[PDB]
Amino acid sequence: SEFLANMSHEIRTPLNGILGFTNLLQKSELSPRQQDYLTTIQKSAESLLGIINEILDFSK
Amino acid sequence: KAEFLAKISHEIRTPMNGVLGMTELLLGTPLSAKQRDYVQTIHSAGNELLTLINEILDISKLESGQIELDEVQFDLNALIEDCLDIFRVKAEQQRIELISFTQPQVPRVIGGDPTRLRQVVLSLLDNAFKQTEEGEILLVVALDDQGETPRLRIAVQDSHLGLIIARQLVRLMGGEFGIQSGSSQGTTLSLTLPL
Numbered sequence: 261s262e263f264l265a266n267m268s269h270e271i272r273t274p275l276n277g278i279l280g281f282t283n284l285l286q287k288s289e290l291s292p293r294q295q296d297y298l299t300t301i302q303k304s305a306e307s308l309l310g311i312i313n314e315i316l317d318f319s320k
Numbered sequence: 321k322a323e324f325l326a327k328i329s330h331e332i333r334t335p336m337n338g339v340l341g342m343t344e345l346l347l348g349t350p351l352s353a354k355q356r357d358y359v360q361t362i363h364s365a366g367n368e369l370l371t372l373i374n375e376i377l378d379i380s381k382l383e384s385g386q387i388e389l390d391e392v393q394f395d396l397n398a399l400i401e402d403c404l405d406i407f408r409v410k411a412e413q414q415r416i417e418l419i420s421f422t423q424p425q426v427p428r429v430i431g432g433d434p435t436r437l438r439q440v441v442l443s444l445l446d447n448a449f450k451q452t453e454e455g456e457i458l459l460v461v462a463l464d465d466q467g468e469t470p471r472l473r474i475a476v477q478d479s480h481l482g483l484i485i486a487r488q489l490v491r492l493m494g495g496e497f498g499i500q501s502g503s504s505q506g507t508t509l510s511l512t513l514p515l
Contacts, residue, residue: 263484270372270481271332274365278339281358288355294346301342301362304335311331 264319268312275312278305326380329373336370372482375439379485382492389492390433396472397428400461403441407449407457415454422461430472430515436489441474443486444509448478451507455479464512471495472515477508486511 282301290298343363351359381387404420411418441459448457457478464473477500490497495513 263481266481267376271369274369277365278362281362285355285358288352290355291349294349297342297346297349301339304338304342308332308335308339311328311335315328 261319264315268316268319271312272309275305275309279309322380322383323386326377326384326386329377329380333370333373333377336366336373340366340370375482375485378436379488383488389436391431392434393429393431394434395428396426396430396461397422399434399438400441400459400474403438403445404459406442407445410449411457414449414452416449416452417456418459419456420459420461423463425463426461426472427515432493432513437493440486440489440511441476443482444474444476444511447480447483447509448476452478455506470515472513473510474513475508475510477506479506483509 279302282298282305286295286298286302340363343359343366346359347356347363378387382389400420400422404418407418410416445457445459455478457476460473460475460477462473462475464471487497490511490513493513495511497509497511500508500510
């Protein structure tokens with residue numbers, strides 16, 4: 261199915277950007293709560309990137 | 321298959337709202353100008369991405385018989401003119417001449433699903449600018465009496481996953497959705513609906 265592949269790619273590109281900026285923020289000067297708030301974003305975004313990886317093989 | 325997408329888009333929605341919620345709280349805590357720029361960028365990209373996902377879930381629910389369309393009287397021109405104002409600001413960042421032209425015989429008020437029709441026309445406009453470079457984008461609202469009862473025609477010509485969702489909506493709306501293109505005339509996306 262081409263839709264799932266298109267949906268995955270459409271989601272992946274912003275998603276790597278999210279992770280990219282999240283990483284950058286993690287390297288910066290932030291409080292533990294901020295860092296903790298960031299760790300949840302990373303976890304959620306990484307989990308989301310795991311799902312769309314399934315979808316992209318599922319289409320295959 | 322419609323329930324398979326709805327299940328997928330659901331699984332994808334939950335972590336997304338997790339990201340946005342966290343960014344929302346981050347925006348409320350002390351941040352440097354650069355940090356806030358990063359967080360604001362994560363928040364903008366996150367919302368655009370949640371919007372698409374919700375539109376994917378929305379159409380899947382509609383095709384799974386799980387929800388239905390809205391049928392209410394509603395000011396067509398106001399809707400059209402609300403969508404064009406969303407793209408005015410981008411027609412002058414992207415040196416584009418955005419024009420509109422509603423026909424004489426078109427009624428002001430019609431019945432249908434306003435919020436989802438708004439999604440459709442915005443999707444055709446979004447496509448249009450992304451395919452156009454310093455040209456003209458022409459949105460036309462007209463009537464199409466070909467096929468017994470008179471029918472509303474909304475077309476956007478210019479000089480793609482949201483467009484697929486837009487086409488499914490038009491079909492559930494009992495309409496047709498077509499694509500025109502000529503070397504001299506540019507590409508035209510149109511959607512003919514019942515009145």
